[PDB]
Write a protein that binds this ligand. Structure first.
Ligand SMILES: Nc1nc2c(ncn2[C@H]2CC[C@@H](COP(=O)(O)OP(=O)(O)OP(=O)(O)O)O2)c(=O)[nH]1
Ligand SMILES: [Ca+2]
Length: 344
DNA sequence: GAAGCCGGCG
DNA sequence: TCCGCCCGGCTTC
């Protein structure tokens, strides 16, 4: 198992820098707004000059200006960032036996057969990938090379920005021993707080505690996952799937409960969603906003995926099922979501 | 099966 | 130390 994890450096801001080179070297902030009850905005991405002045993602925009008065504040343009992401993902495509797209800026590559099981050529490949993405798209990325997915990510994370993390087969055991508990994917701040207040600060501190004492705080799946990881037993493979969802939402001319009216609009959302997709989804979800604006949704999974034609029937049903769950209340806006896409 | 609560993520 | 046509795990009825 040779995994190369690729993560695009401050992606949205970096794209803005490429389109307008005048921002390069100046503090830049990409802003995301909301048209809900309040119209206020927040930080989506800050470049490193902004991050250096203390600007972080999710920071309310008002606050970011307090600490970065000198920064340039721009609106978010998803479609462009998506186009970039699309292009770069394709470049990676031809460098991997198997490729898993995790998000708009994160991919995992299995390169084991590519580099003939030789870990050194694997590192050489990562360097090539870095170099190519920079030359083709003028985007700098951070990569992580490791025997499994989770390590490959965890080391890239320690190597940002424009870095190249490497954990070799022989370094693994020590690395697990070395690892702080909160540094591990799946453990947010809240879980860490609770784990530290029970004597666990490092990954190897799990071994001494009994599985039941752990579960109580952890859950079920995480406990198991932690156990295997600490013992270096984790090795979930890289799959040919994209974790990025694609959806279309359409407003109705007026509020209704009538399927014959809603369907033509659902059918259109489905069409537009399937055009955005480059594979076969394994889940369809019908989302419906009611008069009082609250959300009602429901999906179905398909082991072997759903094709465009067969989605009309299923989506229709899901809609009826939503209308049987909420009787005597009209819809306003419908949408469909497609995820768990199988690639290639 | 499914509503709702909670931690985590992008 | 913030929001999501959020999203999955888990607990509960
Ligand atoms: N509201 C909010 N949005 C966030 C937050 N973190 C990320 N986002 C959204 C906006 C940008 C997008 C990508 O963020 P990422 O951290 O995945 O990636 P990045 O911007 O390249 O930075 P990095 O390389 O450090 O991960 O997801 C957050 O804490 N709050
Ligand atoms: Ca990134």
């Amino acid at each position: 198992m040779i995994v190369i994890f690729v993560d695009f450096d401050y992606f949205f801001a970096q794209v803005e820098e490429v389109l307008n080179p005048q921002y390069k070297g100046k503090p830049l902030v990409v802003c995301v707004y909301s048209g809900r009850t309040k119209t206020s905005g927040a930080v989506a991405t800050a470049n490193y000059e902004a991050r250096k002045l203390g600007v972080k993602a999710g920071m309310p925009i008002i606050k970011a200006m307090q600490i970065a008065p000198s920064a340039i504040y721009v609106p978010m343009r998803k479609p462009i960032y998506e186009a970039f992401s699309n292009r770069i993902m394709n470049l990676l495509n031809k460098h991997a036996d198997k490729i898993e797209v995790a998000s708009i800026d994160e991919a995992y590559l299995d390169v084991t057969n590519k580099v003939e099981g030789n870990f050194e050529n694997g590192i050489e490949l990562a360097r090539k990938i870095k170099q190519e993405i920079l030359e083709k798209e003028k985007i700098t990325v951070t990569v992580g090379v490791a025997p499994n997915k989770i390590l490959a990510k965890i080391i890239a994370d320690k190597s940002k920005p424009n870095g190249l993390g490497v954990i070799r087969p022989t370094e693994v055991q020590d690395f697990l021993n070395e690892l702080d508990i909160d540094e591990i994917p799946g453990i947010g701040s809240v879980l860490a707080r609770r784990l530290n207040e029970l004597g666990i600060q490092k990954l190897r501190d799990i071994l001494s505690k009994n599985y039941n004492e752990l579960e109580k705080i952890t859950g079920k799946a995480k406990a198991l996952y932690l156990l295997k990881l600490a013992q270096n037993k984790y090795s979930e493979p890289v799959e040919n799937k994209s974790k990025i969802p694609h959806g279309r939402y359409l407003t109705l001319p007026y509020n209704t409960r009538d399927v014959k009216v809603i369907l033509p609009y659902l059918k259109k959302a489905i069409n537009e969603a399937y055009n955005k997709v480059n594979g076969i989804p394994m889940r369809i979800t019908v989302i419906a906003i009611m008069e009082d604006l609250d959300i009602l949704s429901k999906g179905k999974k398909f082991k072997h995926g759903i094709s465009i034609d067969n989605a009309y029937k299923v989506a229709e049903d899901l809609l009826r099922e939503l209308l049987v769950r909420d009787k005597r209340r009209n819809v306003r806006r419908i949408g469909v979501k497609l995820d768990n896409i199988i690639i290639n």
